[PDB]
Design a protein around this nucleic acid. Structure first.
Ligand code: CA
Ligand code: CA
Lengths: 62, 105
DNA sequence: TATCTCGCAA
DNA sequence: AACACTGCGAGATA
């Protein structure tokens, strides 16, 4: 459901756009030795090019 | 041959709360050894059933030997969960978040 | 008089 | 060829 998807998309610490720092926080905490230049997923996720991932782009990545 | 892990994946451990694993033989048949500096933090974070693995003994100054806890013994079916936990695409990161939350509460 | 720091012991 | 890890009083405090 939409509620479930927003919850999945609302599992961070802001609630505003997924920022690089937010993705980094998640990837760092789940164990991920990822370079600052290892955005990859999030980087490619950026459809409109604003350097972040909004709800619609998150949905499309999933 | 060490005893098997339970259905829930619970390992039987020695008096210090660790499993001693000095030879592949010493891993339970239904279990696996995951060696990683953070494998413990991970297994604790998932709240899953594990046992810290004493793989050798560090001999050090003053007069005292020390156990080298180089990782974790978990059940086999939790290996990739652990590997995600130690290891962490978008779907993998999201799914681990989904799990972490269905688990905490 | 309530509050941190922080060394300190093992 | 394995003990644990955190309590507890020093000075200082608006
Ligand atoms: Ca954000
Ligand atoms: Ca965007």
């Amino acid at each position: 459901n939409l509620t479930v998807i927003d919850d999945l998309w609302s599992m961070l610490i802001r609630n505003c756009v997924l920022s690089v720092k937010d993705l980094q926080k998640i990837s760092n905490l789940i164990g991920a030795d990822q370079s600052s230049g290892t955005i990859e997923m999030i980087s490619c996720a950026t459809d409109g090019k604003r350097l972040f991932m909004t709800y619609l782009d998150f949905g499309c990545v999933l | 041959i060490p005893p098997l892990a339970s259905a829930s994946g619970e390992i039987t451990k020695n008096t210090f709360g660790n499993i001693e694993v000095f030879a592949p033989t010493m891993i339970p048949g239904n279990c696996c050894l995951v060696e990683n500096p953070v494998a413990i933090k991970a297994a604790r974070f998932l709240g899953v059933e594990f046992a810290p693995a004493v793989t050798s003994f560090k001999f050090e100054r003053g007069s005292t030997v020390k156990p080298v806890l180089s990782g974790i013994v978990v059940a086999k079916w939790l290996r990739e969960a652990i590997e995600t936990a130690i290891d962490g695409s978008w779907n993998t990161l999201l799914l681990k978040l989904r799990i972490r939350s269905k688990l905490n509460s």
